[PDB]
Amino acid sequence: AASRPNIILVMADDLGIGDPGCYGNKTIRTPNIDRLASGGVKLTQHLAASPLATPSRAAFMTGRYPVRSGMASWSRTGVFLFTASSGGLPTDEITFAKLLKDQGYSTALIGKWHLGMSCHSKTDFCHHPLHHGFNYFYGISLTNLRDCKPGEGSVFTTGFKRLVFLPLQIVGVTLLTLAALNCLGLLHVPLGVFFSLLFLAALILTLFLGFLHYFRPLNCFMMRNYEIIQQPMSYDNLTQRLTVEAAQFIQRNTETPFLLVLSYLHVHTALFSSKDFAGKSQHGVYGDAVEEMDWSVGQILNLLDELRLANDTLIYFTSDQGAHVEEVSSKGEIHGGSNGIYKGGKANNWEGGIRVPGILRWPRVIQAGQKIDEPTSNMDIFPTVAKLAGAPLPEDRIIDGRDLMPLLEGKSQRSDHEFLFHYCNAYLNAVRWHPQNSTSIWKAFFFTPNFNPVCFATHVCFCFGSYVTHHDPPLLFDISKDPRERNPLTPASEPRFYEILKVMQEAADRHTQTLPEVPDQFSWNNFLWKPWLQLCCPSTGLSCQCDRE
Ligand SMILES: CCCCCCCCO[C@@H]1O[C@H](CO)[C@@H](O)[C@H](O)[C@H]1O
Ligand SMILES: CCCCCCCCO[C@@H]1O[C@H](CO)[C@@H](O)[C@H](O)[C@H]1O
Ligand SMILES: *[C@@H]1O[C@H](CO)[C@@H](O)[C@H](O)[C@H]1NC(C)=O
Ligand SMILES: *[C@@H]1O[C@H](CO)[C@@H](O)[C@H](O)[C@H]1NC(C)=O
Ligand SMILES: [Ca+2]
């Protein structure tokens, strides 16, 4: 409360809840992170506001549901894939960084943003971290992907199939058959038609070739504030370079309260390690990466000790969302991570994607070794940190996040989340319910995905319909009793079935009455590659090579 301690927010990319040591895993080496759970609280029911990178991060930064800022899509694209697109965290939203920055904190973002860059001009940076509360930024505007490192890139495959291969095949077959018929004297085919097919194939093929050659350079680069330092992004000691920038930040603020947000690229698809982690792993390169990530955390702790700030510094650890279930290469390699006993993962509202690692450590205040089980949200630190810094919560808008200091200081035993909603981009998927006078977790599902190999089909389940199956009355679970979420409830729990789904179903109805009309930050105009938005470090246009790193 107006304490003004140092705040370190550490967010791992896609790290499953069932991967760290302090959570069940027995083979992975996540020491420094366990050396953070034993020193404080371990959230056992930490819920990310979304299964995708962009919206989850959007919710974290704002403490508001992705829909309030219109940072969730209705299409199959739930995250930004082009640095040169105009969609981003709304210029009118307020991040906890801006909040802390106004109270005089030194703010820094090290690593991944994934909330847009510019709007109308390549340099307006309307959505850049420096126009959302951060004084300093070292990292990447978009996100790490297979395509950022030559060896895979099956991120676009589904589209490559529908947009290039298949039509390339229709044209091809059409031309081969037209040639046979014409050659057989069953049809006269004018040169003008063969020309039209060749032309169309050349065009589709050139665009596809263009895409393959430029995607990586135009979308995978390193930045330092408003400038490109490395294009394309190199993996030479990436996790190490983030740490140094993080470490260097803390150090230049040993006497000023500071806010550090370390958003690692790990362990998002396209794993990697330094010379020091390559090989020794559990379930492959992923483990090699996760364990490298942990070495980074530890590196920051020892610095906190070295500088004697560890005692008056709030540290938090989490993952933007669950580990990727359907993430396996072609030559075999099984990536993605694990979410333990839980069902689902990255891209669906099944615990495995909603649930997630949540750790808090503040020596001077939080009782080390503690363990909370009440339902907590990804959006909860926005209000928690605002208080810590004495920054006032915004009153012109609603905040879904709930301060969690009373829960971590034992001043309270129940979290203010008896009604949590689970969206799937713009689509209101599930709905949780921790009844006031009970310890049961009622979870309804207005719909559910449709796991591909009975969702390796499209690489990621959706929220649309052609891959979604609605329910009426709403399907219902009781994660409190059945966490594994491997058995719907209707027989025994039938004495209050229609009863509960009446109190829950109303929530959504009364809830959706606070969802204002806001622009779709994920519309086609805000998601598509805009040439005039492309940052190109060397020359002008598209031939951007950079490495000031
Ligand atoms: C006050 C901030 C205004 C930001 C928007 C500025 C729009 C005009 O700015 C111009 O936009 C062109 C198209 O993107 C660019 O090619 C020019 O280099 C840029 O100067
Ligand atoms: C974007 C991909 C579109 C694929 C559609 C291909 C339709 C076939 O192509 C069309 O075939 C006609 C007769 O064979 C020709 O007269 C047309 O000029 C030709 O464009
Ligand atoms: C530990 O992690 C590996 C992959 O990193 C995974 O295969 C294993 O299942 C995890 N252990 C648990 C808790 O299931
Ligand atoms: C560490 O990063 C530096 C960057 O200059 C590089 O020279 C070195 O080889 C890296 N360590 C590795 C991967 O051996
Ligand atoms: Ca992610």
Side-chain angles (χ1 to χ4, degrees), residues 167 174 178 193 196-197 200 204:
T174 294
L178 237 28
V193 176
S196 304
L197 294 168
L200 180 62
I204 299 171

PDB file of all heavy atoms in Angstrom, residues 167 174 178 193 196-197 200 204, ligand 2:
ATOM      1  N   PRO A 167      -4.848 -23.725 -55.096  1.00  0.00           N
ATOM      2  CA  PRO A 167      -5.232 -23.102 -56.368  1.00  0.00           C
ATOM      3  C   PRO A 167      -4.146 -23.310 -57.420  1.00  0.00           C
ATOM      4  O   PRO A 167      -4.403 -23.309 -58.630  1.00  0.00           O
ATOM      5  CB  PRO A 167      -5.455 -21.638 -55.987  1.00  0.00           C
ATOM      6  CG  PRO A 167      -4.563 -21.451 -54.796  1.00  0.00           C
ATOM      7  CD  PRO A 167      -4.719 -22.726 -54.018  1.00  0.00           C
ATOM      8  N   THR A 174      -5.888 -28.167 -64.412  1.00  0.00           N
ATOM      9  CA  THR A 174      -6.699 -27.628 -65.496  1.00  0.00           C
ATOM     10  C   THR A 174      -5.914 -27.484 -66.779  1.00  0.00           C
ATOM     11  O   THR A 174      -6.425 -27.764 -67.863  1.00  0.00           O
ATOM     12  CB  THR A 174      -7.271 -26.265 -65.144  1.00  0.00           C
ATOM     13  OG1 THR A 174      -8.191 -26.421 -64.064  1.00  0.00           O
ATOM     14  CG2 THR A 174      -7.995 -25.663 -66.331  1.00  0.00           C
ATOM     15  N   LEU A 178      -6.377 -29.671 -70.162  1.00  0.00           N
ATOM     16  CA  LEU A 178      -6.725 -28.883 -71.341  1.00  0.00           C
ATOM     17  C   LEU A 178      -5.728 -29.237 -72.458  1.00  0.00           C
ATOM     18  O   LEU A 178      -6.076 -29.303 -73.636  1.00  0.00           O
ATOM     19  CB  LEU A 178      -6.673 -27.387 -70.996  1.00  0.00           C
ATOM     20  CG  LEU A 178      -7.946 -26.546 -71.216  1.00  0.00           C
ATOM     21  CD1 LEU A 178      -9.167 -27.417 -71.089  1.00  0.00           C
ATOM     22  CD2 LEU A 178      -7.994 -25.402 -70.223  1.00  0.00           C
ATOM     23  N   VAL A 193      -5.939 -19.035 -73.618  1.00  0.00           N
ATOM     24  CA  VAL A 193      -6.343 -19.677 -72.373  1.00  0.00           C
ATOM     25  C   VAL A 193      -5.126 -20.270 -71.688  1.00  0.00           C
ATOM     26  O   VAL A 193      -4.987 -20.196 -70.460  1.00  0.00           O
ATOM     27  CB  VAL A 193      -7.383 -20.782 -72.619  1.00  0.00           C
ATOM     28  CG1 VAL A 193      -7.714 -21.501 -71.299  1.00  0.00           C
ATOM     29  CG2 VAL A 193      -8.640 -20.179 -73.232  1.00  0.00           C
ATOM     30  N   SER A 196      -3.478 -17.433 -70.015  1.00  0.00           N
ATOM     31  CA  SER A 196      -4.147 -17.033 -68.793  1.00  0.00           C
ATOM     32  C   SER A 196      -3.848 -17.951 -67.616  1.00  0.00           C
ATOM     33  O   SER A 196      -3.813 -17.506 -66.468  1.00  0.00           O
ATOM     34  CB  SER A 196      -5.651 -16.971 -69.025  1.00  0.00           C
ATOM     35  OG  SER A 196      -5.931 -16.099 -70.100  1.00  0.00           O
ATOM     36  N   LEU A 197      -3.629 -19.229 -67.881  1.00  0.00           N
ATOM     37  CA  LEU A 197      -3.357 -20.132 -66.779  1.00  0.00           C
ATOM     38  C   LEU A 197      -1.904 -20.002 -66.338  1.00  0.00           C
ATOM     39  O   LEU A 197      -1.611 -20.029 -65.146  1.00  0.00           O
ATOM     40  CB  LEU A 197      -3.714 -21.572 -67.183  1.00  0.00           C
ATOM     41  CG  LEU A 197      -5.227 -21.725 -67.417  1.00  0.00           C
ATOM     42  CD1 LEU A 197      -5.560 -23.035 -68.098  1.00  0.00           C
ATOM     43  CD2 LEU A 197      -5.940 -21.641 -66.076  1.00  0.00           C
ATOM     44  N   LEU A 200      -1.577 -16.780 -64.302  1.00  0.00           N
ATOM     45  CA  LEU A 200      -2.142 -16.889 -62.965  1.00  0.00           C
ATOM     46  C   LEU A 200      -1.227 -17.699 -62.045  1.00  0.00           C
ATOM     47  O   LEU A 200      -1.051 -17.356 -60.873  1.00  0.00           O
ATOM     48  CB  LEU A 200      -3.542 -17.511 -63.051  1.00  0.00           C
ATOM     49  CG  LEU A 200      -4.382 -17.746 -61.796  1.00  0.00           C
ATOM     50  CD1 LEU A 200      -4.697 -16.425 -61.091  1.00  0.00           C
ATOM     51  CD2 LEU A 200      -5.675 -18.460 -62.227  1.00  0.00           C
ATOM     52  N   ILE A 204       0.539 -16.295 -58.663  1.00  0.00           N
ATOM     53  CA  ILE A 204       0.439 -16.947 -57.368  1.00  0.00           C
ATOM     54  C   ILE A 204       1.835 -17.382 -56.884  1.00  0.00           C
ATOM     55  O   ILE A 204       2.217 -17.148 -55.729  1.00  0.00           O
ATOM     56  CB  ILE A 204      -0.502 -18.192 -57.435  1.00  0.00           C
ATOM     57  CG1 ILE A 204      -1.916 -17.755 -57.851  1.00  0.00           C
ATOM     58  CG2 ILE A 204      -0.540 -18.904 -56.080  1.00  0.00           C
ATOM     59  CD1 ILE A 204      -2.853 -18.887 -58.159  1.00  0.00           C
TER      60      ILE A 204
HETATM   61  C1  LIG B   2      -7.014 -17.321 -56.652  1.00  0.00           C
HETATM   62  C2  LIG B   2      -7.004 -18.689 -57.298  1.00  0.00           C
HETATM   63  C3  LIG B   2      -8.103 -18.783 -58.314  1.00  0.00           C
HETATM   64  C4  LIG B   2      -8.146 -20.140 -58.999  1.00  0.00           C
HETATM   65  C5  LIG B   2      -9.278 -20.163 -60.008  1.00  0.00           C
HETATM   66  C6  LIG B   2      -8.828 -20.710 -61.346  1.00  0.00           C
HETATM   67  C7  LIG B   2      -9.961 -20.715 -62.343  1.00  0.00           C
HETATM   68  C8  LIG B   2      -9.487 -21.272 -63.661  1.00  0.00           C
HETATM   69  O1  LIG B   2      -8.844 -20.249 -64.429  1.00  0.00           O
HETATM   70  C9  LIG B   2      -9.618 -19.759 -65.547  1.00  0.00           C
HETATM   71  O2  LIG B   2      -9.965 -20.851 -66.506  1.00  0.00           O
HETATM   72  C10 LIG B   2     -10.756 -20.408 -67.675  1.00  0.00           C
HETATM   73  C11 LIG B   2     -11.087 -21.603 -68.599  1.00  0.00           C
HETATM   74  O3  LIG B   2     -10.295 -22.759 -68.322  1.00  0.00           O
HETATM   75  C12 LIG B   2      -9.937 -19.318 -68.460  1.00  0.00           C
HETATM   76  O4  LIG B   2     -10.679 -18.855 -69.590  1.00  0.00           O
HETATM   77  C13 LIG B   2      -9.612 -18.138 -67.518  1.00  0.00           C
HETATM   78  O5  LIG B   2      -8.874 -17.144 -68.220  1.00  0.00           O
HETATM   79  C14 LIG B   2      -8.796 -18.668 -66.301  1.00  0.00           C
HETATM   80  O6  LIG B   2      -8.471 -17.611 -65.405  1.00  0.00           O
END
